[PDB]
């Protein structure tokens, strides 16, 4: 039996799927710890690895598989259901089994995704400083038509301090914060001027290796709901530019509070895909 994780109806992805738009012919790259491609509820059609000694299609951490399932778990009789279950899903391994990585690995993955014609990049990962090359790579991806989405950070709040990390903080990247099932901001969700939109990031159920499922927390879990939403929009309106997709997501979001804490609010893909 298949169950529908709460994020799917919360962002209104079920409404868009019901219209017949499920991300078909949209290429989404998950830049992460890999994806367990042999999982019954995922269809990984390609990718690449920039982590020495690890293949693109395995995931010794679990994080990448979970993120991928929020984007794209198959619509079938088992497991869960992704936001955009018909997307062409690519695993771009830029983090190792320990869940860590180098900026250069990430840069190589972003470049691979751009060169190989991905429509959407998801980066459920962050670092304190970023790098010149990472800025260049996301700017190049976005300028060449890729919607680039990243988890905002899990550094919480502290007065007026901006706690957004990189690559989320780059202007070419959509920084995604986390709410829970009550649409309340998760306390760990990073805050600041660059925070753009929110999506479900607390208690998110998705695919996990080996051939199973798990419930995780983090802005990592929020980012793929937005990547999936971008894919739904593009599957319905395939000639939109990356900037148009991005603007649809932010301009139709449900206001939740101060933009410092919530950005424009919770994405609403039904409104965004109108």
């Amino acid at each position: 039996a298949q169950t529908v994780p709460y994020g799917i109806p919360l962002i209104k992805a079920d409404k868009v799927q019901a219209q017949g738009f499920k991300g078909a012919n949209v290429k989404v790259a998950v830049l992460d710890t890999g994806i367990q491609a042999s999982h019954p509820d995922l269809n990984v059609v390609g990718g690449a690895s920039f982590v020495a000694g690890e293949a693109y299609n395995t995931d010794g951490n679990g994080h990448g598989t979970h993120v991928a399932g929020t984007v794209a778990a198959l619509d079938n009789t088992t497991g869960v259901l992704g936001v955009a279950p018909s997307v062409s899903l690519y695993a771009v391994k830029v983090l190792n089994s320990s869940g860590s990585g180098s900026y250069s690995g990430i840069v190589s993955g972003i470049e691979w995704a751009t060169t190989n014609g991905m429509d959407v990049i998801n980066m459920s990962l962050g670092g304190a400083s970023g790098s010149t090359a990472m800025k260049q790579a996301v700017d190049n991806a976005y300028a060449r038509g890729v919607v680039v989405v990243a988890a905002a950070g899990n550094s919480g709040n502290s007065g007026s301090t901006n706690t957004i990390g990189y690559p989320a903080k780059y202007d070419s990247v959509i920084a995604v914060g986390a709410v829970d099932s009550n649409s309340n901001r998760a306390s760990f969700s990073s805050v600041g001027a660059e925070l753009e939109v929110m999506a479900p990031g607390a208690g998110v159920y998705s695919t996990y290796p080996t051939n199973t499922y798990a419930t995780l927390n983090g802005t990592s879990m929020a980012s793929p709901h937005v990547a999936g939403a971008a894919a739904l929009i593009l599957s319905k309106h395939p000639n939109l530019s990356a900037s148009q997709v991005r603007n649809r997501l932010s301009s139709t979001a449900t206001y939740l509070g101060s933009s410092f804490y919530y950005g424009k609010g919770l994405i609403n893909v039904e409104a965004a895909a109108q």
């Binding site: 190792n96 860590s100 990592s220």
Partner: protein
Amino acid sequence: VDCSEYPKPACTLEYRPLCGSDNKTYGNKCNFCNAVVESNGTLTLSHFGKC
């Protein structure tokens, strides 16, 4: 905690907090291990979960 494969600047953004011996909450093991390296190995793990 085996932090031998650190430092590494980028980490996943899974929130699976660890509480350091410094009473700071680290977002996940990757964040914690980077902090251990920054401290030249003085930082240890007090317990899993937030402080």
